Write an enzyme that holds these catalytic residues in place. Sequence first.
Site, PDB file in Angstrom:
ATOM      1  N   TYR A   1      22.174  28.129 -62.581  1.00  0.00           N
ATOM      2  CA  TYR A   1      22.298  27.241 -61.342  1.00  0.00           C
ATOM      3  C   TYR A   1      23.391  27.895 -60.389  1.00  0.00           C
ATOM      4  O   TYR A   1      23.247  28.171 -59.375  1.00  0.00           O
ATOM      5  CB  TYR A   1      22.541  25.900 -61.792  1.00  0.00           C
ATOM      6  CG  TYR A   1      22.660  25.136 -60.374  1.00  0.00           C
ATOM      7  CD1 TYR A   1      21.303  24.725 -59.802  1.00  0.00           C
ATOM      8  CD2 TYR A   1      23.532  24.322 -59.922  1.00  0.00           C
ATOM      9  CE1 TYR A   1      21.085  24.018 -58.472  1.00  0.00           C
ATOM     10  CE2 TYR A   1      23.546  23.625 -58.795  1.00  0.00           C
ATOM     11  CZ  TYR A   1      22.106  23.357 -58.247  1.00  0.00           C
ATOM     12  OH  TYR A   1      22.180  22.739 -56.790  1.00  0.00           O
TER      13      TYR A   1
ATOM     14  N   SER B   1      16.124  25.642 -57.360  1.00  0.00           N
ATOM     15  CA  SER B   1      16.986  25.206 -56.089  1.00  0.00           C
ATOM     16  C   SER B   1      18.176  26.261 -55.910  1.00  0.00           C
ATOM     17  O   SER B   1      17.854  27.368 -56.107  1.00  0.00           O
ATOM     18  CB  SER B   1      17.713  23.844 -56.622  1.00  0.00           C
ATOM     19  OG  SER B   1      18.302  22.937 -55.530  1.00  0.00           O
ATOM     20  N   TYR B   2      19.574  25.829 -55.887  1.00  0.00           N
ATOM     21  CA  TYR B   2      20.388  26.856 -55.692  1.00  0.00           C
ATOM     22  C   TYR B   2      20.501  27.913 -56.687  1.00  0.00           C
ATOM     23  O   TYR B   2      20.662  29.060 -56.221  1.00  0.00           O
ATOM     24  CB  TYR B   2      22.006  26.351 -55.792  1.00  0.00           C
ATOM     25  CG  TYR B   2      23.118  27.274 -55.262  1.00  0.00           C
ATOM     26  CD1 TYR B   2      23.620  28.145 -55.957  1.00  0.00           C
ATOM     27  CD2 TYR B   2      23.729  27.077 -54.210  1.00  0.00           C
ATOM     28  CE1 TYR B   2      24.585  28.829 -55.633  1.00  0.00           C
ATOM     29  CE2 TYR B   2      24.604  27.756 -53.547  1.00  0.00           C
ATOM     30  CZ  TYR B   2      25.079  28.851 -54.090  1.00  0.00           C
ATOM     31  OH  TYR B   2      25.881  29.641 -53.605  1.00  0.00           O
TER      32      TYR B   2
ATOM     33  N   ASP C   1       7.981  20.041 -50.371  1.00  0.00           N
ATOM     34  CA  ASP C   1       9.453  20.011 -50.438  1.00  0.00           C
ATOM     35  C   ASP C   1      10.207  19.484 -49.059  1.00  0.00           C
ATOM     36  O   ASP C   1      10.250  20.514 -48.371  1.00  0.00           O
ATOM     37  CB  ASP C   1       9.846  21.395 -51.001  1.00  0.00           C
ATOM     38  CG  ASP C   1      11.275  21.314 -51.838  1.00  0.00           C
ATOM     39  OD1 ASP C   1      12.132  20.830 -51.326  1.00  0.00           O
ATOM     40  OD2 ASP C   1      11.232  22.304 -52.744  1.00  0.00           O
TER      41      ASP C   1
ATOM     42  N   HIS D   1      10.796  18.772 -54.521  1.00  0.00           N
ATOM     43  CA  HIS D   1      11.923  20.104 -54.900  1.00  0.00           C
ATOM     44  C   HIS D   1      12.034  19.635 -56.392  1.00  0.00           C
ATOM     45  O   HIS D   1      12.541  20.492 -57.086  1.00  0.00           O
ATOM     46  CB  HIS D   1      13.176  19.742 -54.287  1.00  0.00           C
ATOM     47  CG  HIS D   1      14.104  20.745 -54.187  1.00  0.00           C
ATOM     48  ND1 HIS D   1      13.746  21.923 -53.972  1.00  0.00           N
ATOM     49  CD2 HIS D   1      15.424  20.741 -54.701  1.00  0.00           C
ATOM     50  CE1 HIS D   1      14.882  22.661 -54.334  1.00  0.00           C
ATOM     51  NE2 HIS D   1      15.913  22.047 -54.728  1.00  0.00           N
TER      52      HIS D   1
HETATM   53  N1  LIG Z   1      21.491  18.695 -51.843  1.00  0.00           N
HETATM   54  C1  LIG Z   1      22.803  19.032 -52.717  1.00  0.00           C
HETATM   55  C2  LIG Z   1      23.196  17.621 -53.229  1.00  0.00           C
HETATM   56  C3  LIG Z   1      25.031  18.201 -53.634  1.00  0.00           C
HETATM   57  N2  LIG Z   1      25.377  16.832 -53.642  1.00  0.00           N
HETATM   58  C4  LIG Z   1      25.886  16.338 -54.792  1.00  0.00           C
HETATM   59  O1  LIG Z   1      25.183  16.625 -56.054  1.00  0.00           O
HETATM   60  C5  LIG Z   1      26.744  15.099 -54.877  1.00  0.00           C
HETATM   61  C6  LIG Z   1      27.021  14.365 -56.035  1.00  0.00           C
HETATM   62  C7  LIG Z   1      27.737  13.115 -56.255  1.00  0.00           C
HETATM   63  C8  LIG Z   1      28.470  12.884 -54.914  1.00  0.00           C
HETATM   64  C9  LIG Z   1      29.169  11.606 -54.776  1.00  0.00           C
HETATM   65  C10 LIG Z   1      28.430  10.281 -54.681  1.00  0.00           C
HETATM   66  C11 LIG Z   1      29.290   9.122 -54.816  1.00  0.00           C
HETATM   67  C12 LIG Z   1      30.642   9.310 -54.967  1.00  0.00           C
HETATM   68  C13 LIG Z   1      31.221  10.660 -55.107  1.00  0.00           C
HETATM   69  C14 LIG Z   1      32.874  10.725 -55.539  1.00  0.00           C
HETATM   70  F1  LIG Z   1      33.156   9.986 -56.446  1.00  0.00           F
HETATM   71  F2  LIG Z   1      33.263  10.393 -54.262  1.00  0.00           F
HETATM   72  F3  LIG Z   1      32.962  12.290 -55.620  1.00  0.00           F
HETATM   73  C15 LIG Z   1      30.422  11.784 -55.208  1.00  0.00           C
HETATM   74  C16 LIG Z   1      28.200  13.669 -53.727  1.00  0.00           C
HETATM   75  C17 LIG Z   1      27.281  14.837 -53.767  1.00  0.00           C
HETATM   76  C18 LIG Z   1      22.195  19.829 -54.017  1.00  0.00           C
HETATM   77  C19 LIG Z   1      21.355  21.212 -53.611  1.00  0.00           C
HETATM   78  C20 LIG Z   1      21.929  22.086 -53.422  1.00  0.00           C
HETATM   79  C21 LIG Z   1      21.265  23.202 -52.997  1.00  0.00           C
HETATM   80  F4  LIG Z   1      21.582  24.567 -52.688  1.00  0.00           F
HETATM   81  C22 LIG Z   1      19.747  23.269 -53.033  1.00  0.00           C
HETATM   82  F5  LIG Z   1      19.182  24.310 -52.765  1.00  0.00           F
HETATM   83  C23 LIG Z   1      19.503  22.207 -53.070  1.00  0.00           C
HETATM   84  C24 LIG Z   1      20.026  20.861 -53.740  1.00  0.00           C
HETATM   85  F6  LIG Z   1      19.499  19.812 -53.857  1.00  0.00           F
END
Ligand SMILES: N[C@@H](CCNC(=O)c1ccc(-c2cccc(C(F)(F)F)c2)cc1)Cc1cc(F)c(F)cc1F
Lengths: 728, 728
Positions: A509, A592-593, A670, A702
């Site tokens: 990942y 994904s990533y 996607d 996705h």
């Molecule tokens: N889109 C990207 C989502 C990344 N965000 C998270 O995983 C994430 C997970 C949890 C939170 C979150 C939600 C509520 C509260 C909190 C807090 F507690 F404040 F930290 C964090 C915010 C963001 C992942 C991603 C990255 C890629 F590179 C790709 F190609 C596809 C993808 F889906």
Amino acid sequence: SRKTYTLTDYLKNTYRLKLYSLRWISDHEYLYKQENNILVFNAEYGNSSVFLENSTFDEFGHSINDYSISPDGQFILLEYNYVKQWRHSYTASYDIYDLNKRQLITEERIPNNTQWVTWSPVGHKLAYVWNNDIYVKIEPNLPSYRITWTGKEDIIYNGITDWVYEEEVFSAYSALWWSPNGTFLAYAQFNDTEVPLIEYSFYSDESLQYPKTVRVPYPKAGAVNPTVKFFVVNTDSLSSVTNATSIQITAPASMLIGDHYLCDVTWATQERISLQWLRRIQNYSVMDICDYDESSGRWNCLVARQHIEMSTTGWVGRFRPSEPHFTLDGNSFYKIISNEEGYRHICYFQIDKKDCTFITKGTWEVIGIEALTSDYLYYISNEYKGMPGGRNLYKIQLSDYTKVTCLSCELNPERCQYYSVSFSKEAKYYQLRCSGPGLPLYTLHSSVNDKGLRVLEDNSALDKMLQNVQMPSKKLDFIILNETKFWYQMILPPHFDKSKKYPLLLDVYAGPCSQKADTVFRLNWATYLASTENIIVASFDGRGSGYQGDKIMHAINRRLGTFEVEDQIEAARQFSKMGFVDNKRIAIWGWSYGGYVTSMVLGSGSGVFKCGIAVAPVSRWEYYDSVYTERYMGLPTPEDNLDHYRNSTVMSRAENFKQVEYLLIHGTADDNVHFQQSAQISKALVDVGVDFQAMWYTDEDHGIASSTAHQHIYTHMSHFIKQCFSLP
Amino acid sequence: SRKTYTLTDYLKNTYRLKLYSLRWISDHEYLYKQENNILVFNAEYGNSSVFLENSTFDEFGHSINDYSISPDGQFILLEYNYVKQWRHSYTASYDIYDLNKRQLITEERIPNNTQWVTWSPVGHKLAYVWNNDIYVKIEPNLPSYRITWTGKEDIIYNGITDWVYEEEVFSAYSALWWSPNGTFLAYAQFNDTEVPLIEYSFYSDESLQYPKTVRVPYPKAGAVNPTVKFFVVNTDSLSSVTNATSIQITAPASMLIGDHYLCDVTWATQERISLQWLRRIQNYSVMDICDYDESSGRWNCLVARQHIEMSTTGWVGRFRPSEPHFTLDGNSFYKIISNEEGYRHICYFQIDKKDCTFITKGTWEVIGIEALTSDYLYYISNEYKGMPGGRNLYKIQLSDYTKVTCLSCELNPERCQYYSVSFSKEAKYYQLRCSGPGLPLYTLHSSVNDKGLRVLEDNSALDKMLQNVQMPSKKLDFIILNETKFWYQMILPPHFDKSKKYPLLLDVYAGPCSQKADTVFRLNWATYLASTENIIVASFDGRGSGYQGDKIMHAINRRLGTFEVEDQIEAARQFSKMGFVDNKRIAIWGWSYGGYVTSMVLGSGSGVFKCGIAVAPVSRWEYYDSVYTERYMGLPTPEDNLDHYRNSTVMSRAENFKQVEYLLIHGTADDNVHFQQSAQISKALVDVGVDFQAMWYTDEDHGIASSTAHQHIYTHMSHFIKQCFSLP
Ligand SMILES: N[C@@H](CCNC(=O)c1ccc(-c2cccc(C(F)(F)F)c2)cc1)Cc1cc(F)c(F)cc1F
Ligand SMILES: N[C@@H](CCNC(=O)c1ccc(-c2cccc(C(F)(F)F)c2)cc1)Cc1cc(F)c(F)cc1F
């Protein structure tokens, strides 16, 4: 044992893990569903039994996707007619049921295609979003007062996140917050007016003669973002004949100077709500605290009770800044922020004091604040045995910051190193959810005593069957690369012989704050590969990876497509420096990533890897969404970081793919990593005369998660590997 | 010989076939281009030399795609800035050059992005279409008078075919016809107002951050078609200050009762134009002949000089009804129509007489009418040696219909069995273009004498090099299936040993009026397969195939996806009844229609074939365009033929693919067979848990013709075949 964990075991789910999914409604009462039976277990005594018999809805007339019981035990919300949108978002249909009066409502019903719906946190009010506009209902049959009037499809979003906010910021469809009373509906408004659209084809049933075009407000790196306004409204004082007044809260000045996002909403007291704001360049955030002027009807955010969060080495937060936790009075809060040495720990704040006080310290991190009492704060951390792969419940004494008790480290050291927790109201009782290295183990507890009342699920059923099967074992270790320890995990085939050369699959990942090496028990593809096909499946957390502090995590800042990719290669070298790797048969893969990283690695021309699979990969950061991409890369402009942007594409590496076998898979619908990204890679390799292998998946996203396709894609991928490794 | 025709030979074009591309301007003067040198060869004497030196445009300032010399020798049109649209259509930029006055024009120029442009057939007028409107220019510098005002993009087309007309009806972008004088501009108008759109993604250079959505007015089977109006305008009487009057010609009554297309425009005399009309159900056509009322200014189509063409067994024409040929006076015409026994022959008509007279007969067909004199009509037919695979020039005496002279049958019986012809004006002189079975052979002739003056190109260069190489040989033969002879062709590997078992590849087109077995010399993929990889590459013309009369051709009427598919399977059985086929190693492949048949055959579960490649296949006729699909299938409605339509999809056969290896290839920007069609197949196979191999081609069309991709695709397919056949 003669048998083996097979592809079909994985795909058909031969061996189930049992969960124990409970839901507190009091400080000692929670619920468990059983063959349709909604029981109510009383942790205080044990004299638990029926709440709602399985047959209560055998006549209902619809298949029932989900239910919500009002906190005041009086109603049940019935969610049927589920229809997915994005990751968290969907639309549904809803019927309300009077528990007190064995009757299903029929009047002033909640409308079909409802975007979101939720109980007031105490009482039985309902807030629901439908057509982008928020509606409130004090009583389950009285007409609903329309709060907002501006909802336009794919332009104005009231009470709900647009795509980017859904995925990147809040991780929900919902942009509604109740005040812990039931008085105030906080909500955000999202204006997508000048956001560009992503457009792709959706093909549908064979019958659909023209493909439909899907169109989604989606800001790629540096494109025009959505803008946000935040409002609060009173629910009580709601005339059934005047359009309600929602009091806008405007953002701080340091924010309105330019592009910004709203990145947290946590209530403090009945009349005090916190907000956090992030600048489009996500190294600077501010928190507002706002009180209700009870005579004025306004909201006042005292400039003297603001708190800046910022980073010079990176971005603020793990993905976003953490939420605060307020003490009963709502005059101070606890919050995980990065410390001076770069470790995410609990800092204790006073509303008015700039500086906070670190009530935890060390070379390890706090994962989350779980509950706060008059006496204790409970939190999960990876402190135990110096292991970032691990998760434990800890307890700190409010009256004294050295009285740290670990509540879980010791229960089953061999079985249980990855805990998570669910607290009762007032935090009277708590469930522990152990996730590995043994089989999941669910157990109940009392705060007061700490003593382990009941075992809720120990999966010994699963354990019985597993003794029949040749399971892989799982090594979790580190290697040292500078004076830094980097963790890996291997899934070793059965009867692992350290003198033989096994083929190795590097499962990737590698994204910012990733953790691929942990203590968690998993039954996935890797299990089938190790067990049946005698393939070591590795994973490695190099720079950019999380929970080991800002020095490793921010190492990747502004440099995506570099250290993380290189560490992945390095890791492989190190596994073949050990003695069990057939170094003529190292492969890589990722989704994904991690598909991106797998593509970059293959294009590196390090000749370490023979073949590789990229599922749904990013190929060029300018194609991904602003809020994610910019967080790490900043703006794709020559005055900003247009350089590393243009230097980190898979397409630019296409010449080097001559040296490898390559399988590229993408879902065609996607919404997230657009098929575009894969279509650009293919074209690049075609232009440079490189052969490879391709698979698309019609109408898949996705997740490539539909039952038929998930089966197809893991099947397809399996052959590819076997072929690449020559396995009969 | 030690060397072999290799993949790289095919791909890189190691061995070129030389053409001889000439263009008549008089009855004895034609042009040939040479290292940029436009010469003018005088067939009468031979004293030919310079017309325009190669350097004339070394300063021009742009790369020159094409040129058009006005008939009256006075100008040259210069086409540069070529940009493809569909199969025939494109936009370009144009400069005019005064030959008489060694000067390039600079005033009132023909505008960039011009859709079409053409000289008047005598003189030097110009008709040009731009923005969907027609413009006339009497002189190369005077302002242009706007004929039409209604041109709207993708809705109104004046002087040019919309998508479906371009591909299916006329095979040009152009909907303009000059009267042999230069007086009348006949043109058609296409209203696409309620035509549905096909929408697909186009991804462009890496740099394009959002993919673009292409939208094209394209009627699928049974959708709303475009509608057509036809007009004639006078070019001479054109005030430079009054919007011109175009006299609409309305269609016959038998047409206006419902959906119809315009399916031919042939001028007869300076004041008489023929039209043909086809009903949406394409078994009934009518021809109008219309004269100019020189006092009235109207056009009159005498109901007594109409001529009905129809079929009970099939559709009218091979693809469309044939064009007429008018005698100088314009009172009678010759036309190829089907006879009483179902053979396409020349019928001689009088303007006013219902019945015509068949001036040729037999079990064989006329291919085309090539020229008409006061004394002779010249035509191509496959009559010689009873061979439908062959093409020859024949001559008939107008004054006596038994005086049939074959002009080509005898020239080089061994080398030359596939002729085509180019005639000088007045048909004074003619070029023969021999295409096989030997190397192409271009030779010049005089009508008067019939004697062969000059050899123009004999490819003996190509022939030199070929003696070094182990070329495959080509058997062309028939087998009998009922009391019907069905032709096939095999490309036999070098030193073919009839006692050994060779692997066989069945190469498929199979569509209505197809002919895959002929006497033509080809250097393609097949050549590399047979030569280097010792694979027999067969082809077979079963029912539905053309040039053998309506009984074979219409056999497939309303039944597409049946006999043609079955005969393909039958054919294979018959090759393994012979003794040289390793019947554990029969494969099938095909592009476009043939991709479909290849997919149906694989889905038949006849277990005859091991593997197969489908390029750009139709998968469900309701996805194809109306005008093609309906010609054979009629309407997809239960009162019509909705049954065979729904019974003839590849998706419905998905289960049977379990038995085979399958390679599916589609270009993503296929405006013709939409990627949809392949996307539905893949989905079907995924739903039934069949594994297969897939390749898409970013931004490619139905041709997969870009230099990098055509190389990629034939490479990829080669590996697949080799793998399937186990070839080291
Ligand atoms: N889109 C990207 C989502 C990344 N965000 C998270 O995983 C994430 C997970 C949890 C939170 C979150 C939600 C509520 C509260 C909190 C807090 F507690 F404040 F930290 C964090 C915010 C963001 C992942 C991603 C990255 C890629 F590179 C790709 F190609 C596809 C993808 F889906
Ligand atoms: N669209 C199909 C057209 C094949 N060729 C023709 O229809 C055609 C149409 C018209 C003519 C023609 C043009 C001018 C004049 C005449 C005539 F008057 F008959 F001499 C005929 C000659 C050939 C090919 C095709 C068929 C398929 F099934 C498919 F899936 C994709 C494809 F592209």
